[PDB]
């Protein structure tokens, strides 16, 4: 037997799924359509570059 409050086995390794990590961490916008904004275009460009990188 092991101690009362302990766990017999070590925590199981969390195997990252690259597709899931990409989907959750960087998700493409759902609302593709938008109108003209002076800062919105810049923000969209920066977000696209960061997602790609």
């Amino acid at each position: 037997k092991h101690p009362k409050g302990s766990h017999r086995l070590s925590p199981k390794v969390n195997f990252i799924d690259v597709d899931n990590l990409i989907a959750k961490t960087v998700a493409e916008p759902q609302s593709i359509k938008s109108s003209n904004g002076s800062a919105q275009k810049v923000r969209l460009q920066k977000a696209e570059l960061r997602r790609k990188f």
Partner: protein, 205 residues
């Protein structure tokens, strides 16, 4: 993985669910230029209190269970400490009965010696060859039987042993001389052949 140390139980039963385990590890000392064993004693959790002093076990890393206890037993490779108490109790029980039996034998022998004239008796049988005392002595070649000595038994046993040894050896040599006769012996009985011949020849005798 959780740290794992092989050890020997050196103290048990002193505290509740806790033992001392003797862990040795290999270290290199530069001043000596030597690989030497470095020794420490860990206070270790023993839930179920199975391990006994002298057993060979692991102690494996665990959460802090007390101020000084950070390891728990996992399994007992050698149960020598466990066996040392089972054998102790069994030895006590067996020694008691064996004592009783041998004491009974000694008391019986004391009684025989208490009950307790062979020369006179044997001469009375010899002269006879009167009737009533002779019968009473009979109840108590007959002279030869009453005087047969244990040395004759030793002589005949020694002759038996010597004859057995010599006959075994001479038959082994005889069969080894003729190799085909050895194979015939093997087949009738139904360097490997050497051992088989030896076994069969001794089983014959």
């Amino acid at each position: 993985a959780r740290q794992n140390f092989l050890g020997l139980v050196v103290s048990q039963g002193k505290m509740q669910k806790t033992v001392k385990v003797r862990v040795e590890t290999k270290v290199f000392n530069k001043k000596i230029n030597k690989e030497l064993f470095h020794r420490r004693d860990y206070l270790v959790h023993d839930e179920g209190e199975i391990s006994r002093e002298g057993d060979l076990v692991r102690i494996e890393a665990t959460r802090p269970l007390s101020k000084r206890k950070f390891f728990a037993i996992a399994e007992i490779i050698r149960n020598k400490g466990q066996q040392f108490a089972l054998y102790e109790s069994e030895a006590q029980l067996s020694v008691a009965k064996e004592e009783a039996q041998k004491a009974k034998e000694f008391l019986d022998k004391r009684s025989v010696r208490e009950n307790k004239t062979l020369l006179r008796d044997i001469r009375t049988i010899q002269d006879a060859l009167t009737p009533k005392e002779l019968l009473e002595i009979k109840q108590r070649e007959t002279v030869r039987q009453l005087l047969q000595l244990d040395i004759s038994g030793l002589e005949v046993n020694l002759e038996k042993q010597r004859s057995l040894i010599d006959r075994i050896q001479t038959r082994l040599s005889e069969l080894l001389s003729n190799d085909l006769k050895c194979d015939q012996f093997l087949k009738d009985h139904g360097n490997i052949k050497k051992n088989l011949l030896r076994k069969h020849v001794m089983m014959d005798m």
